Paper text:
The smoothened receptor (SMO), a Class Frizzled seven-transmembrane helices (7TM) G protein-coupled receptor (GPCR), is a key component in this signalling pathway. The activity of SMO is suppressed by the PTCH receptor, a 12TM protein. This suppression is disabled when Hh binds to PTCH, leading to phosphorylation of SMO's cytoplasmic region, which induces the translocation of GLI transcription factors into the nucleus to activate target genes. Here, we present the crystal structure of the multi-domain human SMO in complex with a specially designed TMD ligand, shedding light on interactions between the CRD and TMD.
To facilitate crystallization, human SMO was engineered by fusion of a Flavodoxin (FLA)16 protein between helices V and VI, replacing part of intracellular loop 3 (ICL3) between P434 and S443. The N terminus 1–52 and C terminus 559–787 were truncated and a single-mutation E194M was made in the hinge domain (HD), which slightly increased the protein yield without affecting its stability compared to the construct without this mutation. The resulting SMO–FLA construct was co-expressed with vismodegib, and then purified and crystallized in complex with TC114 using the lipidic cubic phase method. We determined the structure using room temperature data collected at an X-ray free-electron laser (XFEL) source at 2.9 Å resolution. Since the room temperature XFEL crystal structure potentially represents a closer-to-native receptor conformation and at a slightly higher resolution than the synchrotron structure obtained at cryo-cooled conditions, we describe the XFEL SMO structure below, unless noted otherwise. Analysis of our multi-domain SMO structures indicated that the nitro group introduced in the TC114 ligand does interact strongly with K395 in SMO as designed, and enhance the π–π stacking between the benzoyl group and F484 on helix VI. The CRD is positioned straight up on top of the TMD and is supported by extracellular loop 3 (ECL3) on one side and by a linker loop (residues 181–190) on the other. Furthermore, on the extracellular side of the structure, helix VI is extended beyond the membrane surface by four α-helical turns, and the top part of helix VI is tilted at a non-proline kink towards the CRD, protruding into its hydrophobic groove and bridging a key connection between the CRD and TMD. In the vismodegib-bound structure, the glycan partially occupies the cholesterol binding site precluding cholesterol or oxysterol binding to the vismodegib-bound structure, whereas in our XFEL structure the side chain of I496 from ECL3 extends into the cholesterol binding site, also precluding cholesterol or oxysterol binding to the CRD. In fact, our structure demonstrates that in the absence of sterol binding, ECL3 interacts with the CRD hydrophobic groove to stabilize the CRD in a ‘closed' conformation.
Numbering used by the authors:
A (entry chain A): 59 to 433, 1002 to 1148, 444 to 553
B (entry chain B): 59 to 433, 1002 to 1148, 444 to 498, 505 to 561
Write the structure that this text describes.
């Protein structure tokens, strides 16, 4: 028999509607007493149309359907209305959290033991509700609870990024394919020539560039993996069809974490190897100049920090499980869902490598500049009858002085040969050619030339100059004669002698140009100069990468808000009221800049392409020549 | 009955001496009236002893004996002395010319019709004078009037030279035999080789040497003829036994003129052929830069001069007849008796050949310092990283340039392999070795090395150089690799590669030395060089021959005087009244120096055919004349 507490006294009225939310009712009489907002059957039906807006977020729709029928259209028999049980009310509370977040549970729909008593026959339990509901365009029906997006239980955020169009996806994928393929090809070539000359190329100053290339090559594979037949969807989408978030996760393939490790580890190992490059260039200077020695046996110290620090970071990300997948970039990365993790694991280490790496580039430049000031003394000895070589000597003297040299210009007529060149870094000898039948040096240079053995030319950096006339046999013969004696004594001829035809005043810029080139030939370690250009080149690209990561960090807080606001509005679970126009009324107020990402990738992949040019010398042609030759 | 004019009135005195100059007198009384210098018989006898000094020069002694007896010891019978006939007086005048030349005929011995009447009975005509006189040691009795020495009629100068001993004659004859036989043998060998390959060897710059040898061969025969058994005495001595002087002479054998023509003609034809040799070298050496053959038409004009000039001179000597024989030299020559003819026909032509021949040798040395600077082209391509090979290349370049080459020094980095070697006589490739585990060529040389096929190396004269370090295994591996590829392409590697260990500045003179030796192995005209040495060699020997002939010319005037003074002194012809010696004579050493320089020219010129080619000439001669080919005949 029915319980007295499971029923309430109310006047029974015949059912004007034979259907409740698509399901037929076994009874013929109802009551508008249980629904506090409705007075009539026409009003209760009107409220059900507003409540049917919860079709979206179906895991709520399945439990809210019988409860709404048990309150708005209940069973009335012999002036008694059937009350809905407490279990029917409590079943909605969880999955229908959206109600309390949007509209709020009304007085009559809250689980009060007075309104919803314990252990009552629901009547709606016998009634079968076939209707399931569906998920709106941005979302997708997922059975997996781990794939449910916020409030909307039963639905999940789709794999393809809803903020960017298919056209933008195709455009970004073409951009990664182009840069990835070039960087992959270029670095492969560099790794190949290094192993083809492995015993010789293992020398510590240049071996850094092999490992710098190794990282960008491995990184290229991670970015290009998305291009294999259907790989992108194995890396970015979950088994059901929703985007991968908060990776490493249970009951899902490793395809996302594998590609993340390849991309992030190689990115971090590469930036640590850049700091090794900056340190090495900086320390190689003080090995010759002052006291510091080459660390050509630091294999167990450089490989220690370059392979350990990215390992600690990669392991830490998998621990906090912040590996998120993305369709536009086609890779799994740290902090796509939560911007804070991308800032902590990417922006902070890149900032640390720029300050530590930048310090070494500044230090080495300061060492380069201090060495040049200790090698800036120059002696200019000239032999001139008519003053043409005297004028050239003076013109050379100002160009060196303007460049930071301490020039000492002397006339050969007023000099003593014994120990003349002692205390000078550069010695420039100038002499005009005389003699009709033959080559005769200018009269004042003869005593110096004859006793050139006593000057201290052995190992001295020298260059010759002089004035002559083409209208004479043996043009600038003095320059030839001086260059020959200096070469025989052991001097280091810096440049081919400046031979002036005619009036030197008209060849002013030739003299200025020669003196410019003569300082240019003063080598401050050619083998180490390349290491410095590559250091400053890598810094430039790393600085652009940092800027782009800073833009995303400083703005993603607003983009995440806009992502939430758009997806939740598009979910169409407007329980409260019907819109003025059918109009969708959903827009993205602000989204991430794809240009900034393209600038980021250009700077990233560009470092790999820039560092691969380390092996773009004549020596490399010779390396593969021996290989082919010796293979044959 | 005796004529009144064939006798004079004088007091007869008995003969104190029964003998007159070794002959007994048929009468017993004499007179001292006919002899104007003698008053007594003791005085007349005393004058006969001074007159008996004319025993020497017997052509005179035989006729003066009866005349001296008919004047100093005449027949006196019944206070009448017999006068000597005019015919007895006139018979002495000719052969006793010495008397009138030295002392002069006295008043009583001159043929006056008063003192010597015509047609008188000379009682001395019945008296037989057995004495015939004598000729002292350097002279010898000759019946031939053409063989009589100066005033001494009946005697002639002996064949063997009185100024030189038999010991000196034997010594000089041994010296001529030795040099003559060697020169004869050596020149015969050279004449045989030029004939054994006449066609190939008839080339005109070199065929001069065949005719130069031909003259010394013929000359050798003339000098050696004296060694044929008894020949020397047929060449040097006249039929009687006196030395041959101014041969061509009547009723004497041709043995002296034959040997003279052989010796003098060959001596003169040889010195004219020396002037041809000097002229030919001078003109051929000058025309080396052009195909112009200067000795082309001249060939005929060369034989004209060399065979006519000695002929004209030989004929001229036979005309002036100054061919004199000599025992010490064993040959007949021009101007042995009169030094002036030897000076004119021997010293003057030899002086003329030295001034004309000397001019051409000078002109040829002027050509030597005109031609060197003018024509060799050399390319030096180097591969240098550290500048060591660049420095070596420059050191090599300045050395070739100093020697007269036109050097083109290039860096391998700035060269195109395609026909790179085209237009150069010499190509010098330089490269350093690189590579840690192996041999790797200097970086700039690799493109050139790889396309070395296209350089034009086939048959090109090349040499390699390069710097290395012994500290690295495979020292100068690049030098090895380059000359191996060059050898495989068909190039001519001139010298083994200059491989520098360490700094080339410390090995400067080694580079200088190597560069020098590289220039040498480039073949030159060895035939022209050889012609020039033989020209200067022949001049040297001719200059010594001239010196020796000048010594004899400048001194024989004194030697001729000493020859006359010594010979006439020994003779002892005392018309009426001891230290007989040679004051100065010719130097036999000077003659030995003369022969050494003369015969030495022939021996020196015969060495022209002392090459490897000659061995081949006689190899092909034997086989060819043995019927077989290089194995056996087909
Ligand atoms: C994350 N995100 C979203 O749209 C997004 C997705 C999910 C949620 N959410 O809440 O679930 C929120 C968002 C929002 F709020 F919009 F950000 C963007 C994805 C695209 N994009 C990129 N970012 N980095 C790189 C790059 C450069 C160098 N290395 N890498 C790794 C990169 C490279 C190529 C192309 C794009 C790139 C910027 C951020
Ligand atoms: C000439 N005379 C006389 O003694 C002589 C003879 C006769 C009178 N006289 O009045 O009747 C005078 C003299 C005198 F005054 F003594 F000289 C010497 C003879 C020997 N001798 C030589 N001279 N030439 C040659 C030779 C050199 C190159 N070619 N030839 C042909 C030669 C060769 C070999 C050996 C000796 C040689 C030196 C001179
Ligand atoms: C005697 C004489 C010889 C010369 N020989 C040469 C010569 O060998 N090579 C040459 O290039 N110029 C030659 N010149 C030109 C001078 O080198 C030229 O004028 C030069 O500019 C003079 O230099 P100065 O003014 O420094 O003394 C010669 C000029 C003279 C008058
Ligand atoms: C990497 C290296 C490899 C070398 N290999 C060789 C070698 O195999 N054999 C050798 O003789 N020298 C070798 N050397 C020495 C050089 O040939 C030497 O320094 C030379 O003088 C360089 O001359 P350059 O200035 O013309 O280039 C080597 C030197 C270096 C630095
Ligand atoms: C919401 O869903 C209902 C039912 O599917 C549909 O009629 C309506 O057009 C949707 N509204 C919007 C704005 O998407």
């Amino acid at each position: 028999p029915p319980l007295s507490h499971c029923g309430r006294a109310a006047p029974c009225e015949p059912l004007r509607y034979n259907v409740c939310l698509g399901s037929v009712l076994p009874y013929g009489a109802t009551s508008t007493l249980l629904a506090g907002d409705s007075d009539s059957q026409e009003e209760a039906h009107g409220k059900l149309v507003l409540w049917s807006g919860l079709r979206n977020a179906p895991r709520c729709w399945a439990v809210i359907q019988p409860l709404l029928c048990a309150v708005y259209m209940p069973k009335c028999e012999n002036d008694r209305v059937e009350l809905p049980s407490r279990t029917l009310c409590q079943a909605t509370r969880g999955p229908c959290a959206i109600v309390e977040r949007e509209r709020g549970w009304p007085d009559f729909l809250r689980c009060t033991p007075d309104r919803f008593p314990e252990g009552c026959t629901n009547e709606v339990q016998n009634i079968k509700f076939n209707s399931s509901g569906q998920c709106m365009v941005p979302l997708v029906r997922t059975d997996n609870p781990k794939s449910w997006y916020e409030d909307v239980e039963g639905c999940g955020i789709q794999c393809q990024n809803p903020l960017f169009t298919e056209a933008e996806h195709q455009d970004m994928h073409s951009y990664i394919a182009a840069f990835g393929a070039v960087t992959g090809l270029c670095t492969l070539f560099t790794l190949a020539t290094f192993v083809a000359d492995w015993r010789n190329s293992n020398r510590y100053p240049a071996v850094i560039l092999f490992y710098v290339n190794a990282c960008f090559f491995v990184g290229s594979i991670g970015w290009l993996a998305q291009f294999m037949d259907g790989a992108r969807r194995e890396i970015v989408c979950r088994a059901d069809g929703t985007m991968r978030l908060g990776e490493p996760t249970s009951n899902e393939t490793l395809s996302c974490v594998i590609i993340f490790v390849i991309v992030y580890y190689a990115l971090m190992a590469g930036v640590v190897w850049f700091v090794v490059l900056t340190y090495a260039w900086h320390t190689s200077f003080k090995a010759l100049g002052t006291t510091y020695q080459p660390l050509s046996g630091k294999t167990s110290y450089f490989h220690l920090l370059t392979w350990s620090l990215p390992f600690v970071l990669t392991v830490a990300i998998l621990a906090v499980a912040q590996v998120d997948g993305d369709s536009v970039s086609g890779i799994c990365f740290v902090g796509y869902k939560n911007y804070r993790y991308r800032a902590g694991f990417v922006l902070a280490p890149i900032g640390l490598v720029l300050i530590v790496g930048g310090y070494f580039l500044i230090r080495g430049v300061m060492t380069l500049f201090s060495i040049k000031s200790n090698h800036a003394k120059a002696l200019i000895v000239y032999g001139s009858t008519t003053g043409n070589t005297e004028y050239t000597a003076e013109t050379i003297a100002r160009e060196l002085a303007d460049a930071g040299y301490e020039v000492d210009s002397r006339d050969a007529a007023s000099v003593e040969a014994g120990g003349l060149f002692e205390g000078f870094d550069l010695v420039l000898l100038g002499c005009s050619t005389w003699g009709d039948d033959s080559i005769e040096l200018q009269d004042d240079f003869i005593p110096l030339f004859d006793s050139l053995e006593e000057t201290g030319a052995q190992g001295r950096k020298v260059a010759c100059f002089g004035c002559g006339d083409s209208s004479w046999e043996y043009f600038c013969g003095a320059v030839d004669a001086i260059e020959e004696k200096l070469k025989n004594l052991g001097a280091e001829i810096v440049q081919d002698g400046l031979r002036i035809d005619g009036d030197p005043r008209a060849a002013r810029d030739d003299i200025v140009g020669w003196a410019h080139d003569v300082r240019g030939a003063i080598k401050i370690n050619e083998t180490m100069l390349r290491l410095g250009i590559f250091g400053f080149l890598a810094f430039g690209f790393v600085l652009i990468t940092f800027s782009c990561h800073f833009y995303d960090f400083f703005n993603q807080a607003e983009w995440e808000r806009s992502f939430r606001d758009y997806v939740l509005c598009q979910a169409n679970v407007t329980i409260g009221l019907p819109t003025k126009q059918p109009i969708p009324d959903c827009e993205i107020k602000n989204r991430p800049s794809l240009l900034v990402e393209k600038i980021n990738l250009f700077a990233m992949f560009g470092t790999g392409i820039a560092m691969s040019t380390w092996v773009w010398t004549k020596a490399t042609l010779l390396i593969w020549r021996r290989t082919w030759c010796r293979l044959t």
